[PDB]
Design a protein around this ligand. Sequence first.
Ligand SMILES: [Cl-]
Length: 301
Amino acid sequence: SGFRKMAFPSGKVEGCMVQVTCGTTTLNGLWLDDVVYCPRHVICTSEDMLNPNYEDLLIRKSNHNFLVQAGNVQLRVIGHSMQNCVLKLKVDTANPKTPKYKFVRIQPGQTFSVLACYNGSPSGVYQCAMRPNFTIKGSFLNGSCGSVGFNIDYDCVSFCYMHHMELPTGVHAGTDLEGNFYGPFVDRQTAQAAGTDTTITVNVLAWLYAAVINGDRWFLNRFTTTLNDFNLVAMKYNYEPLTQDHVDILGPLSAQTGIAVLDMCASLKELLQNGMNGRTILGSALLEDEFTPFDVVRQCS
Ligand SMILES: [Cl-]
């Protein structure tokens, strides 16, 4: 029983975290085999933050300009290259703690664990979702850059996020591990801001299924709705459209609870129109949208 925001165990990722210094800028790097991955803005100075030419800035750098520290052990940089907004520092030593890994880009609405790090040192681990507007509501202080987001399947670490910046609303923007930004964000100083965000409808439904599995069923009702009649109410409350594919993904939760997806949709519509009336679901007074169908199955089986 119970339902918590649950992160993947962080051990496999902890072994990969390193400190990277260029001039007076220190941030975090990810050390897999003989490569260290970090935000390219590590080569930036306060002078050129407005419109850096990273190609120019990188060409003016030497291997020896990069200080890489795994604990107290310096790593010698024997090569550097840019891949999109990420820096690749070739080092002379392969990380003996390199887990089975890959670089996977995730979809908005999907969740991942963040290992928040300072000076190559892990500080904490928490669950995040990629928001529909391609920001994450992270918890990050100065020096958190290069902190990574990941999922673990079996032995395999799927890296999906590297942290680059905080936007004016206090939300976070970053890249995949190939250095391509999530959303329209750029690693330069502009008026860029998070666009209007929406609620991840399929996740809210997965969470109502988690509640039913955990004996919360006060929000259930006898009514059903059509996919299109639901979507007409969703749109009004700034909820993402629900697709047949979403209905099909909820199938295993439908079956386990014997509540039809379009049945649970009638509950959600009721909850959107009338609120909670001072009641709670799984210890929340809001509709939670940062648990996927997978997260619910994983924790509620
Ligand atoms: Cl995904």
